[PDB]
Coordinates of C-alpha atoms in Angstrom, one line a residue:
Chain A
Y1 CA 0.0 0.0 0.0
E2 CA 2.5 2.6 -1.1
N3 CA 2.8 5.8 -3.1
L4 CA 4.9 5.9 -6.3
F5 CA 7.6 8.5 -7.0
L6 CA 7.6 10.8 -10.1
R7 CA 10.8 10.9 -12.2
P8 CA 11.5 14.1 -14.0
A9 CA 12.9 16.6 -11.3
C10 CA 12.5 20.0 -12.8
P11 CA 11.3 23.2 -11.2
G12 CA 7.6 23.8 -11.5
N13 CA 6.6 20.2 -11.6
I14 CA 5.1 17.8 -9.1
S15 CA 7.4 15.5 -7.2
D16 CA 5.1 12.8 -6.0
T17 CA 1.7 11.1 -6.7
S18 CA 0.3 11.7 -3.2
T19 CA -2.9 13.6 -2.7
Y20 CA -2.7 16.8 -4.9
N21 CA -5.1 19.4 -6.2
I22 CA -4.7 21.6 -9.3
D23 CA -6.8 24.8 -9.7
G24 CA -7.0 25.2 -13.5
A25 CA -9.6 28.0 -13.8
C26 CA -7.4 31.0 -13.4
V27 CA -5.9 33.8 -15.4
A28 CA -2.6 35.8 -15.0
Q29 CA -1.9 39.5 -14.6
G30 CA 1.7 40.2 -15.5
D31 CA 4.2 37.5 -16.1
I32 CA 4.8 34.4 -13.9
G33 CA 7.6 31.9 -13.9
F34 CA 7.3 28.2 -13.3
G35 CA 7.9 27.3 -9.7
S36 CA 6.9 30.6 -8.1
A37 CA 4.2 31.4 -5.5
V38 CA 1.1 33.3 -6.6
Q39 CA -1.6 35.3 -4.9
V40 CA -5.3 35.9 -5.7
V41 CA -6.0 39.6 -6.4
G42 CA -9.7 39.2 -7.4
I43 CA -12.5 36.9 -8.7
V44 CA -14.5 37.4 -11.8
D45 CA -17.3 35.0 -12.8
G46 CA -15.9 32.1 -10.9
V47 CA -12.4 32.7 -12.2
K48 CA -9.4 33.7 -10.0
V49 CA -7.0 36.4 -11.1
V50 CA -3.5 35.7 -9.9
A51 CA -0.2 37.6 -9.9
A52 CA 3.3 37.0 -8.7
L53 CA 3.8 37.4 -4.9
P54 CA 4.4 40.9 -3.7
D55 CA 5.6 42.0 -0.2
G56 CA 2.8 41.6 2.3
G57 CA 0.7 39.1 0.5
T58 CA -0.5 35.6 1.4
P59 CA 0.7 32.9 -1.0
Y60 CA -2.1 30.7 -2.5
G61 CA -0.3 28.2 -4.7
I62 CA 2.6 27.5 -7.0
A63 CA 2.6 27.8 -10.8
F64 CA 2.7 24.4 -12.5
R65 CA 4.6 23.3 -15.6
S66 CA 2.6 22.4 -18.7
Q67 CA 3.9 21.8 -22.2
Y68 CA 0.7 22.8 -24.1
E69 CA -0.7 25.8 -22.2
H70 CA 2.7 27.7 -22.1
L71 CA 4.6 27.3 -25.3
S72 CA 6.9 30.3 -24.5
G73 CA 8.7 29.0 -21.4
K74 CA 6.8 31.0 -18.8
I75 CA 3.2 32.1 -18.1
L76 CA 2.2 35.3 -20.0
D77 CA -0.4 37.9 -19.2
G78 CA -3.9 37.0 -20.2
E79 CA -3.2 33.3 -20.3
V80 CA -5.1 30.5 -18.5
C81 CA -2.9 29.2 -15.7
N82 CA -2.4 26.0 -13.7
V83 CA -1.9 26.5 -9.9
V84 CA -1.1 23.7 -7.4
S85 CA -3.0 24.2 -4.1
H86 CA -2.3 20.9 -2.3
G87 CA 0.6 18.5 -2.8
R88 CA 4.4 18.3 -3.1
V89 CA 6.1 20.5 -5.6
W90 CA 9.6 21.7 -6.6
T91 CA 10.1 25.4 -5.9
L92 CA 12.8 27.9 -6.8
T93 CA 14.9 29.1 -3.9
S94 CA 17.6 31.6 -2.9
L95 CA 18.8 29.6 0.1
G96 CA 22.3 28.1 0.4
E97 CA 21.8 25.1 2.6
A98 CA 18.9 22.8 3.3
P99 CA 16.8 23.7 6.3
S100 CA 15.6 21.3 9.1
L101 CA 13.2 18.7 8.0
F102 CA 9.5 19.6 8.5
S103 CA 10.3 23.2 9.3
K104 CA 8.2 26.2 8.2
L105 CA 9.1 28.0 5.0
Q106 CA 9.1 31.8 4.3
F107 CA 8.7 33.4 0.9
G108 CA 10.6 36.4 -0.2
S109 CA 9.6 38.7 -3.0
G110 CA 8.8 37.2 -6.4
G111 CA 7.7 33.9 -4.8
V112 CA 11.0 32.4 -3.9
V113 CA 11.8 30.5 -0.7
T114 CA 14.2 32.4 1.5
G115 CA 13.3 31.5 5.1
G116 CA 13.0 28.3 7.2
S117 CA 11.8 29.8 10.4
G118 CA 8.2 30.8 9.8
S119 CA 5.4 30.6 12.3
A120 CA 2.8 28.8 10.2
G121 CA 2.3 27.8 6.6
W122 CA 3.9 25.4 4.2
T123 CA 6.6 22.9 5.3
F124 CA 9.8 21.5 3.9
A125 CA 9.5 18.0 2.6
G126 CA 13.1 16.9 2.5
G127 CA 14.2 17.4 -1.1
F128 CA 17.1 19.7 -2.0
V129 CA 18.9 19.6 -5.3
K130 CA 20.8 22.1 -7.6
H131 CA 19.6 24.0 -10.6
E132 CA 21.5 26.5 -12.7
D133 CA 23.9 27.8 -10.1
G134 CA 20.8 28.0 -7.8
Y135 CA 18.9 25.5 -5.9
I136 CA 15.5 23.7 -6.0
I137 CA 13.6 22.6 -2.9
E138 CA 10.6 20.5 -2.3
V139 CA 7.6 22.0 -0.6
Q140 CA 4.4 20.5 0.8
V141 CA 1.5 22.8 0.1
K142 CA -1.8 22.4 2.1
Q143 CA -5.1 24.1 1.4
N144 CA -6.0 26.2 4.4
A145 CA -2.6 26.8 5.8
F146 CA -2.2 30.5 5.1
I147 CA -5.2 32.6 6.0
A148 CA -5.8 36.0 4.6
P149 CA -5.6 38.8 7.2
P150 CA -8.8 40.5 8.0
Chain B
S1 CA -69.5 34.5 -20.6
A2 CA -67.4 32.7 -18.0
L3 CA -67.8 29.3 -19.8
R4 CA -67.0 30.8 -23.2
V5 CA -64.1 33.1 -22.6
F6 CA -62.2 30.4 -20.7
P7 CA -61.4 26.8 -21.7
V8 CA -63.5 24.0 -20.3
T9 CA -61.8 20.7 -19.6
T10 CA -63.3 17.4 -18.4
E11 CA -60.3 15.5 -17.1
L12 CA -61.5 15.2 -13.5
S13 CA -63.4 12.3 -12.0
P14 CA -66.7 13.2 -10.3
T15 CA -65.6 11.7 -6.9
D16 CA -62.3 13.5 -6.6
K17 CA -61.7 16.3 -4.0
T18 CA -58.2 17.6 -4.8
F19 CA -55.8 17.8 -7.8
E20 CA -52.1 18.4 -8.0
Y21 CA -49.6 19.3 -10.7
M22 CA -45.8 19.4 -11.1
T23 CA -43.3 22.0 -12.2
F24 CA -39.5 21.7 -12.5
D25 CA -36.4 23.9 -12.8
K26 CA -32.6 23.7 -13.1
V27 CA -29.4 25.6 -12.3
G28 CA -25.8 25.4 -13.3
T29 CA -22.9 27.2 -14.9
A30 CA -19.8 26.7 -17.1
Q31 CA -16.3 28.1 -17.0
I32 CA -13.1 28.6 -19.1
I33 CA -10.6 26.0 -18.0
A34 CA -7.1 24.9 -18.9
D35 CA -5.7 21.4 -19.7
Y36 CA -4.9 20.3 -16.1
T37 CA -7.8 21.1 -13.7
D38 CA -10.0 19.5 -11.1
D39 CA -12.5 22.3 -10.4
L40 CA -15.3 21.5 -12.8
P41 CA -18.5 23.2 -11.6
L42 CA -21.7 21.3 -11.1
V43 CA -25.5 21.5 -11.9
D44 CA -28.7 20.4 -10.2
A45 CA -32.5 20.4 -10.5
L46 CA -35.6 21.3 -8.6
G47 CA -39.3 20.5 -8.2
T48 CA -42.5 21.8 -6.6
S49 CA -46.3 21.3 -6.5
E50 CA -49.6 23.1 -5.9
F51 CA -53.2 22.1 -5.1
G52 CA -56.8 22.8 -5.9
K53 CA -60.3 22.0 -4.6
Chain C
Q1 CA -43.9 42.7 -38.2
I2 CA -40.4 41.6 -37.5
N3 CA -39.3 38.5 -35.6
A4 CA -37.7 38.6 -32.1
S5 CA -35.4 36.6 -29.8
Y6 CA -34.9 36.6 -26.1
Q7 CA -32.1 35.4 -23.8
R8 CA -32.3 34.1 -20.2
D9 CA -29.7 32.8 -17.8
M10 CA -30.0 30.0 -15.3
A11 CA -29.1 30.5 -11.6
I12 CA -25.7 29.3 -10.5
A13 CA -26.1 28.0 -7.0
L14 CA -28.3 26.1 -4.6
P15 CA -28.2 25.6 -0.8
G16 CA -26.0 22.7 0.1
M17 CA -24.9 22.0 -3.5
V18 CA -21.3 21.0 -4.0
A19 CA -19.3 23.8 -5.6
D20 CA -17.0 21.6 -7.8
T21 CA -15.2 18.3 -8.1
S22 CA -12.1 19.3 -6.3
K23 CA -10.9 17.8 -3.0
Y24 CA -13.9 16.8 -0.9
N25 CA -14.7 14.2 1.7
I26 CA -18.2 13.0 2.7
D27 CA -19.2 11.3 6.0
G28 CA -22.2 9.0 5.6
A29 CA -21.9 6.9 8.8
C30 CA -23.6 9.5 10.9
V31 CA -27.2 9.7 12.3
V32 CA -29.2 12.8 13.1
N33 CA -30.3 13.1 16.7
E34 CA -32.8 15.3 18.6
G35 CA -34.6 17.1 15.7
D36 CA -33.9 17.9 12.1
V37 CA -31.2 19.9 10.2
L38 CA -31.3 22.2 7.1
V39 CA -29.5 21.4 3.9
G40 CA -26.7 23.9 3.9
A41 CA -26.2 24.4 7.6
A42 CA -23.4 23.5 10.1
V43 CA -23.9 20.6 12.4
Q44 CA -22.3 19.4 15.6
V45 CA -21.4 16.0 17.0
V46 CA -22.7 15.0 20.4
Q47 CA -20.9 11.6 20.9
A48 CA -19.3 8.8 18.9
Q49 CA -20.1 5.2 19.6
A50 CA -17.1 3.2 20.7
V51 CA -18.1 -0.2 19.2
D52 CA -20.9 0.6 16.7
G53 CA -19.0 3.5 15.2
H54 CA -21.9 5.7 14.1
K55 CA -21.6 9.4 15.1
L56 CA -24.6 11.3 16.5
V57 CA -25.1 14.8 15.1
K58 CA -27.5 17.6 15.6
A59 CA -28.0 21.2 14.5
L60 CA -25.4 23.8 15.7
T61 CA -26.2 25.6 18.9
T62 CA -24.4 28.1 21.2
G63 CA -21.0 27.3 22.6
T64 CA -20.4 24.3 20.3
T65 CA -17.8 23.4 17.7
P66 CA -18.8 22.8 14.1
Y67 CA -17.9 19.6 12.3
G68 CA -19.4 19.7 8.8
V69 CA -22.2 20.9 6.6
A70 CA -25.1 18.8 5.3
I71 CA -25.3 18.6 1.5
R72 CA -28.0 18.1 -1.1
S73 CA -29.3 14.6 -2.0
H74 CA -32.5 13.9 -4.0
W75 CA -33.0 10.5 -2.3
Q76 CA -32.0 10.9 1.4
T77 CA -33.8 14.2 2.1
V78 CA -37.5 14.8 3.0
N79 CA -39.4 17.8 1.7
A80 CA -40.8 20.2 4.3
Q81 CA -41.4 24.0 4.4
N82 CA -40.6 23.9 0.7
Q83 CA -37.1 22.7 1.3
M84 CA -35.1 19.5 1.8
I85 CA -34.3 18.5 5.4
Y86 CA -33.0 15.4 7.3
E87 CA -35.7 14.1 9.6
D88 CA -34.8 12.4 12.9
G89 CA -33.5 8.9 13.0
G90 CA -32.0 8.7 9.6
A91 CA -28.6 8.6 7.9
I92 CA -27.2 11.9 6.9
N93 CA -24.6 13.1 4.4
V94 CA -22.2 15.4 6.2
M95 CA -19.3 17.1 4.4
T96 CA -15.9 17.2 6.1
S97 CA -13.8 18.8 3.4
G98 CA -14.3 20.7 0.1
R99 CA -16.2 23.6 -1.3
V100 CA -19.9 24.0 -0.8
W101 CA -22.7 26.6 -1.0
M102 CA -24.0 27.6 2.4
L103 CA -27.0 29.7 3.4
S104 CA -25.9 33.2 4.6
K105 CA -27.3 36.0 6.6
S106 CA -24.8 38.7 5.6
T107 CA -25.5 41.7 3.3
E108 CA -22.1 42.5 1.8
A109 CA -19.5 40.5 -0.2
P110 CA -16.8 38.8 1.9
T111 CA -13.0 38.9 1.5
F112 CA -11.4 36.0 -0.3
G113 CA -9.2 33.9 2.0
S114 CA -10.6 35.3 5.3
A115 CA -11.8 33.1 8.2
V116 CA -15.5 32.2 8.4
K117 CA -17.8 33.1 11.3
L118 CA -21.2 31.6 11.9
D119 CA -24.4 32.4 13.8
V120 CA -25.9 30.5 16.7
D121 CA -28.2 28.6 14.3
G122 CA -25.6 27.3 11.9
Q123 CA -25.9 30.1 9.2
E124 CA -22.9 32.1 8.2
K125 CA -22.8 35.7 9.3
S126 CA -20.2 38.4 8.6
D127 CA -20.0 39.3 12.4
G128 CA -20.8 36.0 14.0
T129 CA -19.8 35.0 17.5
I130 CA -18.8 31.4 16.6
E131 CA -15.3 31.2 15.1
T132 CA -14.2 28.4 12.7
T133 CA -11.2 27.6 10.6
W134 CA -13.0 27.3 7.2
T135 CA -12.4 29.9 4.5
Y136 CA -14.3 31.8 1.9
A137 CA -13.7 30.4 -1.6
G138 CA -14.6 33.6 -3.5
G139 CA -18.1 32.7 -4.6
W140 CA -20.9 35.0 -3.7
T141 CA -24.3 34.8 -5.3
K142 CA -28.1 35.0 -4.6
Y143 CA -31.0 32.7 -5.6
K144 CA -34.6 33.9 -5.5
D145 CA -34.6 35.8 -2.1
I146 CA -32.0 33.3 -0.8
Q147 CA -28.4 34.3 -0.1
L148 CA -25.6 31.8 -0.7
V149 CA -21.9 31.9 -0.1
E150 CA -19.1 29.5 -1.3
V151 CA -17.1 28.1 1.7
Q152 CA -14.1 25.8 1.7
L153 CA -13.7 23.3 4.6
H154 CA -10.9 21.1 5.8
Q155 CA -10.9 18.0 8.1
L156 CA -11.4 18.9 11.7
Chain D
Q1 CA -34.1 -34.1 22.3
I2 CA -34.1 -30.4 21.4
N3 CA -31.9 -29.0 18.6
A4 CA -29.7 -26.1 19.5
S5 CA -27.7 -23.4 17.6
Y6 CA -24.9 -21.0 18.6
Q7 CA -23.6 -17.6 17.7
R8 CA -20.5 -15.4 17.9
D9 CA -19.3 -12.0 16.8
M10 CA -16.0 -11.3 15.2
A11 CA -13.4 -9.0 16.7
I12 CA -13.6 -5.4 15.4
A13 CA -10.0 -4.6 14.5
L14 CA -6.3 -5.6 14.7
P15 CA -3.3 -3.6 15.8
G16 CA -2.2 -1.3 13.0
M17 CA -5.3 -1.8 10.9
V18 CA -6.5 1.0 8.6
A19 CA -9.9 1.8 9.9
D20 CA -11.9 3.1 6.9
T21 CA -11.4 4.3 3.3
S22 CA -11.7 8.1 4.1
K23 CA -8.6 9.8 2.6
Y24 CA -5.5 7.9 3.7
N25 CA -2.0 8.7 2.5
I26 CA 0.7 6.0 3.0
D27 CA 4.3 6.3 2.0
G28 CA 7.2 3.8 2.1
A29 CA 10.4 4.1 4.0
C30 CA 13.4 2.1 5.2
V31 CA 13.9 1.2 8.9
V32 CA 17.1 2.3 10.7
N33 CA 19.1 -0.7 11.8
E34 CA 19.1 0.6 15.4
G35 CA 16.0 -0.9 17.1
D36 CA 12.8 -2.4 15.7
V37 CA 9.4 -0.8 15.4
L38 CA 6.1 -2.2 16.6
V39 CA 3.2 -2.2 14.1
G40 CA 0.5 0.2 15.2
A41 CA 2.9 2.5 17.1
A42 CA 4.3 5.9 16.1
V43 CA 7.7 6.4 14.5
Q44 CA 10.1 9.3 14.0
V45 CA 12.4 10.4 11.2
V46 CA 16.1 10.9 11.8
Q47 CA 17.3 12.1 8.4
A48 CA 16.0 12.5 4.8
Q49 CA 17.6 12.2 1.4
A50 CA 18.3 15.5 -0.4
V51 CA 17.8 14.3 -3.9
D52 CA 14.5 12.4 -3.8
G53 CA 13.0 12.5 -0.3
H54 CA 13.3 8.9 0.9
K55 CA 13.3 8.7 4.7
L56 CA 14.9 6.6 7.4
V57 CA 12.8 6.0 10.5
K58 CA 13.0 4.2 13.8
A59 CA 11.2 4.0 17.1
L60 CA 10.0 7.1 19.0
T61 CA 12.1 8.8 21.6
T62 CA 11.6 11.5 24.3
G63 CA 11.5 15.1 23.1
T64 CA 11.0 14.4 19.4
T65 CA 8.3 15.0 16.8
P66 CA 6.4 12.0 15.6
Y67 CA 5.9 11.5 11.9
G68 CA 3.4 8.6 11.4
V69 CA 2.1 5.2 12.4
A70 CA 3.2 1.9 11.0
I71 CA 0.4 -0.1 9.4
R72 CA 0.0 -3.8 8.7
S73 CA 1.3 -4.9 5.3
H74 CA 3.1 -7.7 3.6
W75 CA 6.6 -6.9 4.8
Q76 CA 6.2 -7.7 8.5
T77 CA 7.4 -10.5 10.8
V78 CA 6.9 -12.0 14.3
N79 CA 9.0 -11.3 17.4
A80 CA 9.9 -13.7 20.2
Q81 CA 6.6 -12.9 22.0
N82 CA 4.7 -13.6 18.8
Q83 CA 4.0 -9.8 18.5
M84 CA 4.0 -8.4 15.0
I85 CA 7.0 -6.2 14.1
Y86 CA 9.0 -4.7 11.3
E87 CA 12.5 -6.0 11.1
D88 CA 15.6 -3.8 11.5
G89 CA 16.4 -3.7 7.8
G90 CA 13.5 -3.5 5.4
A91 CA 10.6 -1.6 4.0
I92 CA 8.0 0.1 6.3
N93 CA 4.7 1.6 5.3
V94 CA 3.8 4.7 7.2
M95 CA 0.4 6.5 7.1
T96 CA 0.5 10.2 7.6
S97 CA -3.2 11.1 7.4
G98 CA -6.3 9.0 8.0
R99 CA -8.0 6.8 10.6
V100 CA -6.0 4.0 12.1
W101 CA -6.2 1.5 15.0
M102 CA -3.3 2.4 17.2
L103 CA -1.9 0.7 20.3
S104 CA -2.9 2.2 23.6
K105 CA -2.0 1.6 27.3
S106 CA -4.6 3.8 29.0
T107 CA -7.8 2.5 30.7
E108 CA -10.6 5.0 29.9
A109 CA -12.5 5.8 26.7
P110 CA -11.3 9.2 25.3
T111 CA -13.3 12.2 24.2
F112 CA -14.0 12.8 20.5
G113 CA -12.0 15.6 18.8
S114 CA -9.4 16.1 21.6
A115 CA -5.6 16.1 21.2
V116 CA -3.6 12.9 21.4
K117 CA -0.8 12.3 23.9
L118 CA 2.0 9.8 23.3
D119 CA 4.6 8.0 25.3
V120 CA 8.3 7.2 25.1
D121 CA 7.9 4.0 23.1
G122 CA 5.2 5.4 20.8
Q123 CA 1.9 4.2 22.5
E124 CA -1.0 6.4 23.4
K125 CA -1.6 7.4 27.0
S126 CA -4.0 9.8 28.7
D127 CA -1.1 11.8 30.2
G128 CA 1.8 11.4 27.9
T129 CA 4.8 13.7 27.6
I130 CA 4.7 14.1 23.8
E131 CA 2.4 16.6 22.1
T132 CA 0.9 15.7 18.8
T133 CA -1.5 17.2 16.2
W134 CA -3.5 14.0 15.8
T135 CA -7.0 13.5 17.2
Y136 CA -9.3 10.8 18.6
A137 CA -11.9 9.4 16.3
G138 CA -13.9 7.8 19.1
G139 CA -13.3 4.1 18.5
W140 CA -12.3 2.3 21.6
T141 CA -12.1 -1.4 21.4
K142 CA -10.0 -4.3 22.7
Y143 CA -8.4 -7.2 20.8
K144 CA -7.4 -10.2 22.9
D145 CA -5.5 -8.8 25.9
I146 CA -4.6 -5.7 23.8
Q147 CA -6.3 -2.3 24.0
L148 CA -6.7 -0.3 20.7
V149 CA -7.8 3.2 20.0
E150 CA -8.9 5.0 16.8
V151 CA -6.6 7.8 15.9
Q152 CA -7.1 10.4 13.1
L153 CA -3.7 11.5 11.6
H154 CA -3.4 14.9 10.1
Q155 CA -0.5 15.5 7.6
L156 CA 2.3 17.5 9.2

């Protein structure tokens, strides 16, 4: 009774076949890069409008890699977008060394992981590899973890 | 002119005291989606009735 | 003497109707106790049987803790007061996770991602006294004289 | 002579049994060669791989964070006392979310929805020294000479 692993290990894709959720009814304002956190700025007709994470926002999900929706290499303004709201996913990071297992991550500007000492939110899942003179980490996203401030 | 300006039907047995009829309705929506999604919206239906004497 | 055409739109929500096919989880091993509940209202658990395993649920009251929201079902519900309810001594379909349309008593649109607060009778309210951990999912509509809101729930 | 008939009821559960089919999540790992782990008892992770995420786990210890509960599966053996275990070197299935039948050493039925307290060896106790996020699901039963309790595991 076990969960299979997923082989390609690139940023912006899913790392396991555990319970995951993909919110595919969204549109982008500005440009978004695969493997970055996004935030919900508004809702029109059951569609969520997302943008790259600013300072002071609450992350909602992580952009997901697809080879039909995004032929350019990144997500462009006015495009339908895939966003992962629950599951394990490879994220871009600016950190230098792996944090403690099962710690709480903190997101800098642009939707990159820079902290490992948060109070509550998403947690580190134990994966840490290297990409392009930069690193990739593995994050565990949960649905109601970050709550929008009143 | 009450029996000539309005239709007269005969589909009622002489020994009946009440009659009932049905009406129905429906709701739903559709959205623009991408290739990988799991948030397809749903639809439903309704019903109700009235009476007579 | 020219022809004409007309255009009409269906409604988009119903009380207790499941918002979409995303993550959801349904508890069907419960039984309603001491009264009846409303489709699209929060419920509370009194006790859980140790051996039998069936949970006992009732409508939310003051000072309690919510567990889930009853959902629509054309077969398990009985029709009273021109609405579907769950009469006493019968199996009930509680929802423990997912997005669902709930009856509301507020008058203004909520903020996406904020926490949900309820009334003492299991109906959402913008300034309720009962505090939960569920969130708003963004949806906000209105049927004929009925106010509905889209709420996202996680396992207790 | 008068004909007679008899009747018996089966035992409800087993140590380490998955209770129901409501959203479980089980992952495989390898057991650290230091010490064996009892099926139905909590475990801890000592270190994780950086490339993939495969984890090495062993028995629980004071002042540590539990990770999951070992469940019955194919790769399991017997101890000297005929108690079911996972060997020092081999595969272990660990559930991180869902309802499981976990070993207990308390004496009183717990209250639904409350927090769970653990012990040094990884068995539930009413006044344990280890804090957890898990909850009680209300099931309180007893296999032959062994007490079991129904625990809901929330993903860390």
